[PDB]
Amino acid sequence: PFTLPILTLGELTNSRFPLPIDVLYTNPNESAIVQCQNGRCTLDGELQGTTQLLPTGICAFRGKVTQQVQDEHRGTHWNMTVTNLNGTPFDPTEDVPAPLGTPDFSGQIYGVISQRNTNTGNLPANRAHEAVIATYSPKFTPKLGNIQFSTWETQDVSSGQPTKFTPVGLASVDANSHFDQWTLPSYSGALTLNMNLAPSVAPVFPGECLLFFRSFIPLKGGYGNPAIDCLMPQEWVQHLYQESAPSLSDVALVRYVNPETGRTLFEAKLHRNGFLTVARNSAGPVVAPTNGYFRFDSWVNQFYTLAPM
Amino acid sequence: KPFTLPILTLGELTNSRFPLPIDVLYTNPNESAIVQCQNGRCTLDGELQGTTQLLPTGICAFRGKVTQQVQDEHRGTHWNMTVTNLNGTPFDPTEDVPAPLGTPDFSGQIYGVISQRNTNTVPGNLPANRAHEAVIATYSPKFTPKLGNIQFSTWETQDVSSGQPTKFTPVGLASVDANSHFDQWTLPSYSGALTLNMNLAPSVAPVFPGECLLFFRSFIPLKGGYGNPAIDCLMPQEWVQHLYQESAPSLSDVALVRYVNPETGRTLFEAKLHRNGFLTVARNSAGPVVAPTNGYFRFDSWVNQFYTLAPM
Ligand SMILES: C[C@H](CCC(=O)NCCS(=O)(=O)O)[C@H]1CC[C@H]2[C@@H]3[C@H](O)C[C@@H]4C[C@H](O)CC[C@]4(C)[C@H]3CC[C@]12C
């Protein structure tokens, strides 16, 4: 039978960046097409886009620095090949948009590049430094098997050594930072066409809007309070993958219940492609008690009318 | 409610004691230290223990507020931080826990990023932000998370703000040299040097001749220096999360599990999954387990403590 995990909002993590879920969120007057590639899983357990199971793999990279690269842009820049997260070489011919875990939004992603040398008191040398990956840059070509990152450090990155990127937040969200959580990177480089994408999601029913699991993302500096909205938390991805339960219809009716009072706070539609919609006519957070969680009710047809929240 | 494990390969598992993928299974029979880690602790019927919590983002993380810069005879720039619970609520030191859930459970110089987003906004009515590399020495007398405050240090000498919401994102270790005090089995003194740790998850050990603990091992990054340090957890975070969800009653003290190659259909070895949440194997060898990448543990039966494991 179909189930959802029993996890409160404070027990869920974002599927699009390594962050706890802070709040549920709606934005009906959203202009952009929602087509994120991480946190994408059908209700019958099929992963899509760049989605993989590891919380540690979201917006992470594994590979090897090849060389420093000279550029007209400020900073120190480095090219690294990218493998799959499990160390195997990335096959650019696989039907995926990019290596699984690749960031799915435009921005200056801030984190830590770390290296542990292959050569060896028979111990290998190590180094780690703050770094930024500009996913909108023409040098961001993960589908081709390589990317560029930049550092404040000017010299202390080694060529030919195993390299890991741990994401932490964003470098900036100012006017020149290109942050847009709904603009996909061009995974094959500048002016290229993405392929093998998880489909876009939209509410079709009148008065319905997408319901998001929202996390606020740290900044290296500057002003802003940026957020990342995912369609389903990573634990739901992991759960749906394990269960692979037959979808008895295209829409699951779920209720967001308060365990203290037993009362249903609101109901939503959980769609077969892995997203939620609610009947709500306003934008902003959902101010719900901390212990609330979604409970599966039943399968319904597409023409079911949600009670307004 | 029957007991189950998730079907996940090692490349689909993450460490429960530091935010890292599982790299290899691992034994160290000649281990002399007492094994009593506090993260990644869960009974087979789903009771979280120690400082264990469910969020992979909460492991070795902190939330709170920098109170002030402080002095220290050691070089660097030093900051005092109050710590709350990870969800932002104030930590209640009377709660029957060793420390705020997610607190690191080992001695070392934990390397990460401290980030801040100010409470006050600036009329486009947006708050200011900063982030810097930081190190938390869990062995320091100033590491008192059970008392609701800790100390971290930065290379950065100035750009850390007092009284503002502060987050610590762990990345790895600063050093594992001789003066770095790295020992994954030595607990922090959660309340300081004159106080006993309380509400601990119990120590684990094989109670059977020829058996040793089996760990899920992750290699942990280093800011610099030499070494190949690793963190061994008793069960991956996904097992903690699964056991908690299922809450299946334990029908004996030992669940027999087999590690299975789903391609060759073969059992590579068997292990005891103990009620307190750890594995043992009959292995005289130390070091990694060479097992195919598609393998995973399968629950086979409830047995007792006298079951003799097939040697691996
Ligand atoms: C190379 C990157 C932009 C590339 C680019 O093509 N920009 C223009 C966009 S477009 O091609 O016109 O689409 C820039 C964007 C943000 C930059 C970083 C951030 O500004 C933060 C850092 C600032 C320091 O002065 C230098 C290092 C530091 C870490 C920078 C390195 C270079 C980065 C990573």
Ligand SMILES: C[C@H](CCC(=O)NCCS(=O)(=O)O)[C@H]1CC[C@H]2[C@@H]3[C@H](O)C[C@@H]4C[C@H](O)CC[C@]4(C)[C@H]3CC[C@]12C
């Ligand atoms: C204050 C910390 C040790 C506290 C301490 O009690 N040490 C002695 C051991 S005990 O008191 O006997 O337990 C030390 C340990 C490691 C140090 C850090 C690391 O060495 C890395 C950094 C090195 C830079 O030169 C300064 C900043 C930098 C980030 C250091 C700041 C101070 C730290 C964090």
